Amino acid sequence: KSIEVLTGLDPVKKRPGMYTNIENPNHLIQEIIDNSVDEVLAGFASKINITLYEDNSIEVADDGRGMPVDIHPEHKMSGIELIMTKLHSGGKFSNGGLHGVGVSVVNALSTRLEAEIKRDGNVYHIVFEDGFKTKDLEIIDNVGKKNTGTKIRFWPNKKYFDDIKVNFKALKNLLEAKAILCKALTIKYSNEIKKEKLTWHFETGLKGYLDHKLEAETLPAEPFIIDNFSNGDSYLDAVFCWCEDPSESIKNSYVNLIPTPQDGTHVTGLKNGIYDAIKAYIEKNSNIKITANDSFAQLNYVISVKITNPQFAGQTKEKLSNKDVTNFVATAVKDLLTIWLNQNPDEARQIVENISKVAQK
Numbered sequence: 001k002s003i004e005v006l007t008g009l010d011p012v013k014k015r016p017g018m019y020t021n022i023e024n025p026n027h028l029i030q031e032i033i034d035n036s037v038d039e040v041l042a043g044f045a046s047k048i049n050i051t052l053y054e055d056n057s058i059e060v061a062d063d064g065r066g067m068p069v070d071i072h073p074e075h076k077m078s079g080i081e082l083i084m085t086k087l088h089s090g091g092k093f094s095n096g097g098l099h100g101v102g103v104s105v106v107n108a109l110s111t112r113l114e115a116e117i118k119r120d121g122n123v124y125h126i127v128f129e130d131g132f133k134t135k136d137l138e139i140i141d142n143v144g145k146k147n148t149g150t151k152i153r154f155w156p157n158k159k160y161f162d163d164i165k166v167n168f169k170a171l172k173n174l175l176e177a178k179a180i181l182c183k184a185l186t187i188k189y190s191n192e193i194k195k196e197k198l199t200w201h202f203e204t205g206l207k208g209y210l211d212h213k214l215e216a217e218t219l220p221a222e223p224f225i226i227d228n229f230s231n232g233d234s235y236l237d238a239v240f241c242w243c244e245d246p247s248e249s250i251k252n253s254y255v256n257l258i259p260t261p262q263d264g265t266h267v268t269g270l271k272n273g274i275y276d277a278i279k280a281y282i283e284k285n286s287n288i289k290i291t292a293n294d295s296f297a298q299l300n301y302v303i304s305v306k307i308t309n310p311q312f313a314g315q316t317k318e319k320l321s322n323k324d325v326t327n328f329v330a331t332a333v334k335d336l337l338t339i340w341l342n343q344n345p346d347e348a349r350q351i352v353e354n355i356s357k358v359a360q361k
């Protein structure tokens with residue numbers, strides 16, 4: 001916030017590959033979904049509904065507060081126009097990417113985008129084409145004051161994509177993943193092309209996931225769960241176990257339900273917390289020169305943090321960089337795993353034995 005930057009959308013149109021995966025429009029759909037997810041994580045939304053239309057357009061609707069419509073005093077336009085028609089960025093000191101850029105990317109790369117916002121008992125409607133407003137924000141209907149949300153329908157522009165056909169299977173996989181990580185959320189999908197509908201809602205969250213993907217034998221036999229740990233405003237969900245069969249390896253990480261394939265400060269936090277717990281257990285109870293690499297080598301895990309202002313790093317913005325996250329995760333992991341290892345000496349001893357054998361080479 002020391003530096004705040006607003007540009008037009010030309011940079012996106014000129015290098016779409018820097019802002020999205022141009023193979024198909026799935027990453028655009030992910031960007032709109034992540035913006036609805038932010039309402040869910042803020043506590044104001046419970047429902048995200050996705051529709052794939054026969055004309056290859058995509059609609060995403062939520063029951064959040066409704067995107068802001070107030071006129072920004074400086075830019076003299078509604079909040080929704082501002083969010084949709086400008087690239088917003090800032091930071092501490094001067095230094096695109098697939099995350100942390102914003103929904104204007106979707107707007108830039110679409111021939112048409114419509115938004116309907118229900119807020120304050122009004123239904124607002126606005127239209128854009130190729131990243132510019134083409135129909136003024138207007139109130140088109142009224143609704144109950146508590147009937148709120150945002151619905152965005154968009155038509156990806158074939159100029160920028162290898163295929164404008166949505167990859168159904170990849171989308172369904174992404175949505176399942178998000179629902180597993182957020183029990184407050186119910187996701188619905190309607191594919192009008194295939195004539196199918198799915199609904200996901202995981203009351204039990206990550207419980208049983210690793211068992212399903214692996215089994216194969218794991219230590220602990222029941223993968224260890226960290227369930228909704230919080231320090232106030234940051235939250236951690238995780239499941240992990242060791243496995244000697246390397247045929248299936250699950251090592252997935254997320255921030256605000258966004259997959260982070262380049263890992264980051266949460267994954268380092270996990271690795272450190274695990275090692276701290278293992279080192280302390282060995283010392284408390286007893287040899288070798290075990291490292292954090294050794295205790296992480298056969299680890300399968302899912303780690304999901306929810307934090308307020310995620311920062312992304314690397315050219316592709318797929319790595320979480322928030323520095324305070326590492327310690328938040330490491331301490332929680334060390335403490336909770338320590339309790340578990342103390343209550344589970346037979347399995348704890350085998351885990352320690354297997355790690356010590358990894359270290360042995």
Ligand SMILES: CCc1[nH]c2nc(Sc3cnc4ncc(=O)[nH]c4c3)nc(N3CC[C@@H](N)C3)c2c1Cl
Nearest residue numbers: 032035036039060064065066067068103150151152
């Ligand atoms: C359909 C996708 C969707 N749903 C939304 N709901 C909302 S609801 C909402 C309402 N009031 C807010 N006030 C402040 C704020 O920071 N975020 C807000 C978010 N906002 C969206 N925006 C605004 C900022 C950016 N993250 C996108 C979206 C978006 Cl995009």
